[PDB]
Amino acid sequence: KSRLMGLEALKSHIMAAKAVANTMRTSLGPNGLDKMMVDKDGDVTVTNDGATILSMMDVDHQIAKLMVELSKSQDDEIGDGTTGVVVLAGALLEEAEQLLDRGIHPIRIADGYEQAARVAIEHLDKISDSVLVDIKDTEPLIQTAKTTLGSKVVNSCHRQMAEIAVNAVLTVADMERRDVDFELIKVEGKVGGRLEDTKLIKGVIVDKDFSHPQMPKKVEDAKIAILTCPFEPPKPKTKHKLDVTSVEDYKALQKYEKEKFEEMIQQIKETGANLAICQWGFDDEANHLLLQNNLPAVRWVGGPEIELIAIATGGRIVPRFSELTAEKLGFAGLVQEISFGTTKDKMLVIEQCKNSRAVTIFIRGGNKMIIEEAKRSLHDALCVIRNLIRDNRVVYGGGAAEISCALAVSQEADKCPTLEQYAMRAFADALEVIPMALSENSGMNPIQTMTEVRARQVKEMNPALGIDCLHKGTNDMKQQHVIETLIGKKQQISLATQMVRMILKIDDIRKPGESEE
Template structure:
């Protein structure tokens, strides 16, 4: 038995522990700091962030998930909120900032309830009731659209692009994106976004971005003697080297007679020539090889008038197979005329000083390439991110066939309906349901703030109009007026909103359940600095 007054040490000295309200306060603070970081990027008038890593590389963007990925975040609660953004990006491609901002506001409202001595479990129950109601009401206010409604799909793409660096060319980009997504729809009406390749080259304005109905490979011919342009191409895809194979085991060949050495070299040459003859015999006039091509084999291929490219990425090989109908062959001996794919044109062209291979006019182009242009590298990268987001939202819309208005309209309407629903909830959960409704209004409020408008006046105006006139009224950030977002063409897929609200709520609930944080310090090499892995739990961002 310990003597009276002697402390009982359970944890080692390099471990910090935060219990109860302290733990909750620290986690909520960390989550809110992350939300505040990306909040100013929301909407068409959102600002950009410049991120500089420890190597001096610069990223300029207002894409929520890119900002959060590039930030060196230490705090575990903050990392959980970054997971929300990553999930949103993976599932729908857009709405990452929305998801994180809602999560941050849900945490702020939860903190207010905790200060009023409402138990975390009651807050969580209230949030779950409100979430269920929100998802029901979202389904009710969603508008059905047909997958072949091209004009509406373009509006969805333009909404996703607006506010990003590519905004000035959004109409041209929207056309390119919608055509690309509609090209890769499979027979079940699903869209495989991996079949849309985004190839980037700086040195031209954004408006020069184009869609290639086929595949662009960032490689050049292996030999300048090969044809630059092949029409009516018969394409072989090889997943094996066009080289003399080395022996499986370490072997040493000793040659005493010079004539034997010549024989040995001639035999190697003969094997390479046979390989090229096999390819030529199938009728192939273009070869894409995933592995290497021997210098001598290059010479024979050039003599045979075959255009060859080596070290092609696996993902590009798969896209070529989809676009041309070719089969990827792992042994040249197995190559038959039936394995070849077809394309109207295979050509090497110079883009921004670099040679690229264009495979175009494919019979059934189930893989396409968007060649993204930008005047500088940073502009081009931001355009590519905007295109990637827009591809995600157009794909979601085609698959689900449901959209909602933008401009904060669904959030204001949901908040109104959830407040009405709160009146039917008994007990302290009612407070949490109302807090959930208030938290959703952070989106229109932030849109107003980022546009230089008065957030309180804007929100009051929006609420009043929603009580009277309808569910699609939102904030036009350019005029400050409340307008019908559907008529203005500001629309988003239903899935963007549902996913954002679900992931924000679940992350908030997970953080609220934590009442004890036990954190070990960093390893010895960092101990001298006095840093702990939790950044002293105060949010070392």
């Protein structure tokens, strides 16, 4: 194989770094123009989302490696911020060429990017120190879910989504805990609904319902019998499923399998519950018996969901039918089979007003692209919202923060006479590329457009108002309500600024060429 060093590597790193910053820059923000992306499979994905673009790209290099990696630490915690962290890393790398071309060693600038990465996140700190409680922040949660639902263009009237993300974060992730819960938030949805068909389910919706509507739709508080046990074909994991191969076998199994389920569905109710959640469902034969034995219960519960309805409800674990006991049961504040407004989306909810250990946002949509349109949008909302419901620290987005940063950055950059005097100043120059590439997408000349904000910063020297991010012509950060959590913007940088510098410290690469990923 081969070892490429210095300028070779220098042209190995920024090269693969430069192009993917470009696909996202015309994808950048709400005006970022979406990208249809098609697999070898005949697939089609219209993506302005970098992480989705990165999920769409298997493209090959340590950069393309780190890129698919870098955004998705921003996309879960903070959500929105996925796009800027990469494109700006390229812009930083875009600079380091000319800046090493000035004869400043890549590690001579390297600290200067991070050194001046301080002022930006430090300047972000200055923007809005506000932190609001759930019931107060819920408007800023949806006011940010104005923006953080905005980029996917599923936002207004989706204040449903915006509000269901308010409680979904609060329900499981506390405000004081500030340990991220996207794991105990259950992201859920189904095709055939509608974007405006939207709900936050507090407990667990199990997809299948009671074996009949001829038995009540409603199981009361708790009494959920947690069951791994066949009332339909078991398909056990220890042996293999086979069915009856003989004529006398359909005779006896029909007669045998009925009276046991008669006994067992009674034995469930003997052990007791108004709901038996079975990993292995009721058959249609066992359905009429759940009717005949006069018990409500769920037929099908997921193999994992038998843990879910156990944990997510806090319901005390009943492993199986043989472990059935009265004191151990799955729990509910109530149990319903809920039509969501489109009977196509129909679930049996085990709902938690007692303890929700998995809170379920249930989105709906005409199809899957539309619910995912909502969900990743709801995600980034739910993300920033959770960030904000932890600490409501916000910042006016669209770069007017960075336009205010870059000036203060490059100034405070010059203060250290060390060669990063200049190098940190060039760092600030990169802070201006995202609203730039946004102003491109906005239909505006970013050059003049930023200088409007520059002038506005010359006016303000912090973002309050700003330029367009959505394309309107009312140029505001505050009144347009272009606002991001103050956290993730700093996290964008922290993710954006070092990877460059980290790639700066690693130019020594054994490769025949870039494509090794």
